[PDB]
Paper text:
MpPA14 (Marinomonas primoryensis PA14 domain) lectin is a domain of a 1.5-MDa adhesin responsible for a symbiotic bacterium-diatom interaction in Antarctica. Bioinformatic analyses indicated the presence of an ∼20-kDa domain near the C terminus of MpIBP that is a member of the PA14 family, which is a carbohydrate-binding lectin module widely distributed across several kingdoms of life. PA14 domains share a β-sandwich fold and the presence of two consecutive aspartate residues in a cis peptide linkage (DcisD). The DcisD motif coordinates a Ca2+ ion that is directly involved in binding polar vicinal hydroxyl groups of various carbohydrates.
Similarly, 3-O-methyl-glucose cannot bind MpPA14 via the 3,4-diol because of the substituted methyl group on its C-3.
Numbering used by the authors: 10 to 191
Write the structure that this text describes.
Amino acid sequence: PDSLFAGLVGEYYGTNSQLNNISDFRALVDSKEADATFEAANISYGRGSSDVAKGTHLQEFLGSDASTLSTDPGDNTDGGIYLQGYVYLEAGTYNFKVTADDGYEITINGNPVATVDNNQSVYTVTHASFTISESGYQAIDMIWWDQGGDYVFQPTLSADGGSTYFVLDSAILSSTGETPYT
Ligand SMILES: CO[C@@H]1[C@@H](O)[C@H](O)O[C@H](CO)[C@H]1O
Ligand SMILES: [Ca+2]
Ligand SMILES: [Ca+2]
Ligand SMILES: [Ca+2]
Ligand SMILES: [Ca+2]
Ligand SMILES: [Ca+2]
């Protein structure tokens, strides 16, 4: 039985190897069990300095979500998160606008909808639009990492052609696709 909460299932992975791109972080995820798990209920993390994977920087980055950490990871030089679950979206057109250091990839129903496949200091990208064909809980996953230095991750979403954007949070997230009443 998987817990039902208004958020995505979060895993944190640290490493002392360099993370240069999405493939490197995905390989880290594949290589071992998560260094910590958490509930990602308010996906607006950071900004901070001096390496996400050091000290209590992960706690600071995750903020409101850090109280669900399964453990306090030890130090690493590099690290990132893998989030997976569901997001309620009505049928229609949407686009992400993501602020991040370093890179990331967001997929919905198996299709990438926001990608930065490299390291970068803090930068905001307005991504291309995508469509949702059927209203309901859509499958979503995210990866984000920090190679070192500063770190931030805020993937906002627009339903109105880029006029307004919202953070993905407990209003619309579900860990299993069932309706949360939490
Ligand atoms: C600490 O500053 C940032 C770092 O966070 C980013 O990963 O890579 C950038 C270039 O090294 C740095 O300027
Ligand atoms: Ca794993
Ligand atoms: Ca720590
Ligand atoms: Ca915060
Ligand atoms: Ca590094
Ligand atoms: Ca960084």
